[PDB]
Amino acid sequence: MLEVCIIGFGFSAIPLVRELARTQTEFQIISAESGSVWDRLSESGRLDFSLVSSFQTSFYSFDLVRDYEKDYYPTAKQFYEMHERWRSVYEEKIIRDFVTKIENFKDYSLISTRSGKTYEAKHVVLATGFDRLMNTFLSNFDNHVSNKTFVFDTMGDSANLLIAKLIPNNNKIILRTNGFTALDQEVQVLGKPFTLDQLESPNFRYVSSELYDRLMMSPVYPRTVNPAVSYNQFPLIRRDFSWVDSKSSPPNGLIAIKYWPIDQYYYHFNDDLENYISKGYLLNDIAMWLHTGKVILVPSDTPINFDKKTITYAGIERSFHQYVKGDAEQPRLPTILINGETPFEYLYRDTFMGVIPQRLNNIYFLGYTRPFTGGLANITEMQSLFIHKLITQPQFHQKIHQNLSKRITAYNQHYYGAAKPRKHDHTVPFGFYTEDIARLIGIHYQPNECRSVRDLLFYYAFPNNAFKYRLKGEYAVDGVDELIQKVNDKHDHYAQVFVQALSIRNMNSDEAAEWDHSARRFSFNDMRHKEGYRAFLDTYLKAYRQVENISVDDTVVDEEWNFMVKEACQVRDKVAPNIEEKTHYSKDEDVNKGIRLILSILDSDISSLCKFEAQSIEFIRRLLQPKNYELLFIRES
Ligand SMILES: Cc1cc2nc3c(=O)[nH]c(=O)nc-3n(C[C@H](O)[C@H](O)[C@H](O)COP(=O)(O)OP(=O)(O)OC[C@H]3O[C@@H](n4cnc5c(N)ncnc54)[C@H](O)[C@@H]3O)c2cc1C
Ligand SMILES: N[C@@H](Cc1c[nH]c2c(Br)cccc12)C(=O)O
């Protein structure tokens, strides 16, 4: 009988197949001939976009140890070509067929296929991905539509990509919204560019959930009164977060869109716009679209006449060309019968770590946990080590399953509280998930074992990418030592994000919210750095039309649209005049000061250590024994 059957091979299954081949575990893959969305987008020539996730979090450790030389955002073409390169390695192990039913029993599972062939396996892994209706909308989208009005009822990464393609052709975008969370995918720290995944320092949650809440949540929750932040200029971008009932922040279930801020897009791509646009690097600054009025937010109750294709706002019956409603992604799961009898019903919170459904036996889910920020690779690489250890080591399989129900209950209370299950429950902060899996597997690090300040920087400030836990130990990948060294040298050993915790150690949430936005350019949604890129935007729109071979008449002025923009931007026109020039930027001066201190005692032992320095050395000493380190779902009962 087959030891392992993997149903679905695209991207999530790659790191698991690598570990099974290394231990020479008997496995077989069954994946359909149709392929994935990247296959459909390749055949139609629609891989002309880039990832919302950084290279260091979007490619696997065993690829990064060879190819990493700098931080950047890969293209969809590079992402798919990596999918194809690995499929070529493992094509001999893939049966091209479609699984239609799985009958799960106490020790094995009976797998049925579309061709009629039957397979038995002791361990079954599902890595089939998700179905999304927006995928087909992207696959049939005509990029030549011009001078039309579009109404979106949902905002997301796919809607933002569609808007990025609609803006340059003089298309007007109406968002009937109940709010959305948008974050600059790259920010500046003292002028230097940082992708947002670099500044999350998740292990500071072990100090206190309140400190880490003040570290992260001011750009999400309306905590600052600073008139330069987008959620003060456009209050309809605010979401209702009354569902949050956990003390772990950012909460599980929170989703955000990652976009190019126009100032960072200009920094990277201005000197070769047409080539970068053709490569897939598209300006998608939703904050810039609201600033210029190319996108307006209207209340969700704004009346739409779907018969006449009109939307009534600002006393205007605005005709629209197309209405866009996003869907909810659902896992591509085949029919699964518990004990061969009872249909299994998927529920993320009824699985352990998104991997182990407790209603089934020896069935594992790979690729259904979504990262809040960064690429899926961080999640699926850690999931693949977790699944591999469960499959190949019976004492670990036993240790996890003996109290599986209690682990799931303890996990849900920690990350969801008393909140009822939501459709977005599968979204987790990547630095929390990778660390949780590392502690479950035993490839984690110990904060009490740091001896120098450099050790505390690596533990707390170095991002919890998958490869961070593959330097030594059971699942070490060769070359990670050089990779971690290269990453440390290019990011000043992450002292800058370490210093942020130093700077807000004695602040309350309101003081930290104001300190976050006291910078000349605060990380996310800074509306002071948009107007200065208006002329560049015109250059961008022209470069886009040349790449796409489009002729767009942008002379006819839409006085009706300008009237709706004025109605929609009343709050902006009231709060933006209150933006005041300042002589000191507290965050910049505090972070620059702390970096000087940290880099001066970088190699000193913590035991071998006039006031800011004194409270910082005390803060550094307390880091050896964090008081919020307990994670109940890690324990065996
Ligand atoms: C438009 C879009 C943009 C994205 N951008 C990013 C990004 O920037 N960064 C990021 O980290 N992630 C991104 N993702 C998510 C992720 O990278 C992709 O979803 C990727 O395909 C990984 O999914 P997967 O390998 O789990 O499943 P897939 O690769 O989608 O599918 C695995 C395979 O399983 C097969 N299969 C399914 N059901 C069966 C069955 N019953 N029997 C047999 N075979 C089956 C399918 O045919 C498919 O070929 C994006 C996703 C989409 C749709
Ligand atoms: N702590 C840094 C970066 C940061 C804050 N909040 C974030 C969220 Br939410 C997602 C990703 C990154 C960040 C800062 O304060 O600028």
Q: What is the DSSP string of 227-242?
A: TTBHHHH-GGG----T
**Could you tell me which residues are beta bridge partners of residue 435?**
none
Nearest atom (ligand 1) to Cα of 129? 27
Question: 3-class DSSP state for residue 598?
Answer: helix
In the structure encoding, which two tokens stand for residue 267, read together?
Answer: 């920094």
| Residue 584 main-chain phi, psi, to 5 deg | -120, 145
Write out the residue limits of the CATH 3.50.50.60 domain(s) in the chain.
Answer: 2-131+329-440
Q: Determine the Cα–Cα distance for residues 165 and 145; give it in Å rounded to an integer.
A: 10
Give 140's DSSP letter.
T
**Could you tell me which residues are beta bridge partners of residue 7?**
30, 126
565 contacts 296 by C-beta, under 8 angstroms: yes
C-beta neighbour count of 355 within 10 angstroms: 23
CA of 36 to the centre of ligand 1 (A): 6
Closest by CA to 559, choosing from 314, 298, 297, is 314
E-strand stretches of 421-471: 427-428
Closest by CA to 352, choosing from 408, 400, 401, is 408
Ligand located closest to 129 CA: 1
| Residue 593 main-chain phi, psi, to 5 deg | -70, -45
Question: Exposure pattern of 57-73 as b/e (b: 16+ CB <10 Å)?
Answer: bbbbbbbbbeebeebbb
Classify burial at 633, counting beta carbons within 10 Å of its beta carbon; exposed 0-12, middle 13-18, buried 19 or more: buried
Closest by CA to 138, choosing from 324, 376, 273, is 324
Question: 3-class DSSP state for residue 189?
Answer: strand
Sequence-distant (≥ 6) Cβ neighbours of residue 440 within 8 angstroms: 353, 386, 400, 634
Classify burial at 505, counting beta carbons within 10 Å of its beta carbon; exposed 0-12, middle 13-18, buried 19 or more: middle
Which of these CATH numbers, 3.40.50.150, 3.30.465.10, 3.30.300.30, 3.50.50.60, describes 2-131+329-440?
A: 3.50.50.60
| Residue 236 main-chain phi, psi, to 5 deg | -75, -5
Nearest atom (ligand 1) to Cα of 332? 38
Sequence-distant (≥ 6) Cβ neighbours of residue 130 within 8 angstroms: 329, 330, 331, 332, 368
In the structure encoding, which two tokens stand for residue 264, read together?
Answer: 């960072």
Closest by CA to 516, choosing from 278, 189, 106, is 189
Q: Determine the Cα–Cα distance for residues 316 and 546; give it in Å rounded to an integer.
A: 34
**Could you tell me which residues are beta bridge partners of residue 291?**
none
| Residue 164 main-chain phi, psi, to 5 deg | -60, -30
Q: What residue type is 33 in one-letter code? A: E
Closest by CA to 409, choosing from 204, 637, 255, 242, is 637
User: What contacts 24+ positions apart, CB below 8 Å, involve 407-412?
Assistant: 407/352, 407/633, 408/349, 408/350, 408/351, 408/352, 408/358, 408/633, 410/632, 410/633, 410/635, 411/352, 411/353, 411/633, 412/349
Ligand located closest to 512 CA: 2
Around 596, how many Cα atoms within 13 Å sit in the side-chain half-sphere?
8
94 contacts 30 by C-beta, under 8 angstroms: yes
| Residue 313 main-chain phi, psi, to 5 deg | -150, 140
What kind and span of H or E run contains 176?
A: strand 172-177
Sequence-distant (≥ 6) Cβ neighbours of residue 566 within 8 angstroms: 314, 573
CA of 200 to the centre of ligand 2 (A): 6
Nearest atom (ligand 1) to Cα of 52? 8
Q: What residue type is 406 in one-letter code? A: K
Experimental resolution (Å): 2.3
- Of the residues 52, 198, 200, which should be mutated to test ligand 2's pocket, given the most ligand atoms within 8 Å of the CB? 200
Locus of tokens 């910049």: 588
Sequence-distant (≥ 6) Cβ neighbours of residue 420 within 8 angstroms: none
Give 50's DSSP letter.
B
- Atom 2 of ligand 2, nearest CA residue: 199
C-beta neighbour count of 255 within 10 angstroms: 14
Give the orientation angle of helix 509-516 with respect to helix 209-216, to 10 degrees.
Answer: 30
Q: Determine the Cα–Cα distance for residues 72 and 186; give it in Å rounded to an integer.
A: 9
Q: Determine the Cα–Cα distance for residues 246 and 476; give it in Å rounded to an integer.
A: 34
Locus of tokens 């009988």: 1
Q: Determine the Cα–Cα distance for residues 548 and 169; give it in Å rounded to an integer.
A: 10
Q: Say yes or no: CB of residue 99 within 6 Å of ligand 1.
A: yes
The CA-to-CA distance between both ends of the chain, in Å, stands at 33
| Residue 550 main-chain phi, psi, to 5 deg | -110, 145
Q: What residue type is 69 in one-letter code? A: E
C-beta neighbour count of 168 within 10 angstroms: 25
Q: Determine the Cα–Cα distance for residues 605 and 617; give it in Å rounded to an integer.
A: 11
Q: Determine the Cα–Cα distance for residues 574 and 414; give it in Å rounded to an integer.
A: 41
